[model samples]
Target: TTHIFHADDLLQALQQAKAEKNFSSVFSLDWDKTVKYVTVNVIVKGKKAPLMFNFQNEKHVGTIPPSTDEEVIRMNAENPKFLVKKRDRDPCLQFNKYKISPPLEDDGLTVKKNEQGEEIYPGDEEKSKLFQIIELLEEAFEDAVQKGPEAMKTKHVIKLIQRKIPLPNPIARIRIKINPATSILTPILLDKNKPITLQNGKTSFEELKDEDGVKANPDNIHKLIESHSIHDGIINARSICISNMGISFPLCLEMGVVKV
Candidate 1:
């Protein structure tokens, strides 16, 4: 296995593979889950356009080619035992190339001020409220978690969101059309697989953990549910758009995902 550290690692891998002329290939790609990269699209007041902020966790893992080319050659040979793997899911094809239309005349959408005497850009204000709803739902989740496992229901969670997060405008609605969550994992099952021999001919039992390196502790069920609920809620919010109200403002918050 070759560890991918930077963008250049992939380039280097391809370059060296071609240079070797022996059909060297990246045998396997394993998402270590030690780090993650994410992008946040936000609109700030007074700016001509919305902004994108990328927050990436950097863990340096250098490329180290394994001393094995038998599989690569075997696959390349005629009547080989290799097959192209089908993609399990889409590779984040979400787009956010939104176009904002400014007013032809001085509509003064940006000139409005909040009660605190600060200039309130509608786009920025709207973005803030969308994110605030996520935070408010998170608080509601905590409240339910404190009441023990009995309060963890889809209806209860949706009702908490409806009651806790106040709507800025009477017409501005926040409704969850589809909530696919019920409660935390009630029964935690640990893998009690028999000990297997390693490559070095040593017997060992694998410890209970997740792909993200979190130990599979039964007590951490609440944390897992909280994480899943917030993530799903945010994904739901991404599809939200206030429309059919007969407003002339530009569509700024529909496609929430952005690219570089």
Candidate 2:
């Protein structure tokens, strides 16, 4: 929903329409003409991409906008609560940050060039570097929570390229949980909308509470670290690249616009 603010009236209106041009704007601002800013939540990050959080709000604000107020409100309801806590002074570091390690161990050597000339590691030498990263994250997390969660605005990205990054294959979400004591991070398998409980397979991330007896929210991640399985810290893959041409043997089994 676009919350149009009348610079003259000083009143705001929350509205949405099929087409952005259709927004009922008694007054409007020029498009991409001036640098503007709005506070929004960063919802995701990729190893190679920028940290991102879409503008989803209760009383939506800004020049551009989104879903109906009801829908936005509904989605906001599902967000993690730690954000609010972290927003306050002395936030809890553990609650605000969530992490998931590489999906498979390919090592730094097992790399290939993509469609572009850029050398892609997909998997890179991490053992020598993973701990450095984790230690930095730990310190950053601690410092930020004390001053303010927002104070530690570290942009993080983990590009576990190749294959499915988001689990459940295609969906744009990658579920994860970690053992706070050991720093073990594992991707949670999804079924019918939530993460499957580690071993019992009885409950889902949505159903189970975090180690602490609090409800899970985007800010506050809840899970039994002890229960999550371990991720072996090892990688020794062979260097490989994609063939410039030719389809898989399976391709001959099917038909389409075949390459000559």
Candidate 3:
């Protein structure tokens, strides 16, 4: 009922899907970094409206450089596929350009002394303003896409945010399709020798193929059976941070070390 395919084998499966009339599927870019830009030639179904298509950090391993506002602006302007349209071409109109510090780790609200020496607990005003811009952007995205204009759609708000935002955490794109003709398309570092199991409850080995018509090959098996170090690192880091603060909570010891 399920098939376990590696990233490398996706193309072949897609090719097969193309040959079959009834199979439907979707694929994603996952968390990989882009060298310069993103070109989405595939048709994607958006949730709220419908998307036809379409980060950096260090202090870790294989970190990528963050995208600058200028980088996104210049690239979007130059690329024929992605261009920004609308009333605000001015640099100041770009809401993302504004740097707003995130709220503190504790209560997320800060108290400031007023002229009357009264402690004022002000809420996150700047964030509210930023969120307002996002709402407008979402409206703009839906409207533009609905109009069926390439220039107005891909080259504008959503594309800019998608191409420019930094990926602090790993994100995945998923696509799914049925062999009988249902269509929908909707990782990490792991060890090389790690044996894995499929969703249908079977151990992975050479020449393995799933009941869902997915085949595993040596070339692409690495993609599927990679290291979980990145994920483990994430959980361990959070656990350490919480525990250090004396926050008492039950922790899962599935992987990584824990300090009492």
Residue-wise lDDT of candidate 3 within 1-260, one digit each (tens)?
A: 21222222333433443455312232221112211222112122322111121011101112121124554466567776965432121111112221233323354444345779665433444222322322332333343344433432343232323212332222221111112243211012223234568889986423333234354222232223222212221111011111222211111111111010
Count of backbone collisions within predicted model 3: 20
Question: What is the per-residue lDDT of model 2 for residues 185-208, given as tens digits with 9 covering 90 to 100?
Answer: 332321123444667657543432
Give the clash count for model 2.
13
173-197, model 1: which lDDT tens digit per residue?
A: 2221211264222222222343557
Model 2 — TM-score against the truth?
0.16
Segments of candidate 2 deviating more than 4 angstroms: 1-110, 113-214, 217-260
lDDT (C-alpha, whole model) for all candidates:
0.26, 0.23, 0.26
Against the true structure, candidate 3 reaches a TM-score of: 0.17
Stretches of candidate 3 above 4 Å error? 1-99, 103-124, 128-131, 147-164, 167-260
For model 1, name the residue pairs that clash: none
Better of 1 and 3 by TM-score: 3
Candidate 3 displacement at residue 20 in angstroms:
39
lDDT of 2 at 94: 17
TM-score of each: 0.16, 0.16, 0.17
Tell me the deviation in Å of residue 152 in model 3.
7.9
For residue 67, give model 3's deviation from the true position in Å: 19
Ranking by TM-score: 3, 2, 1
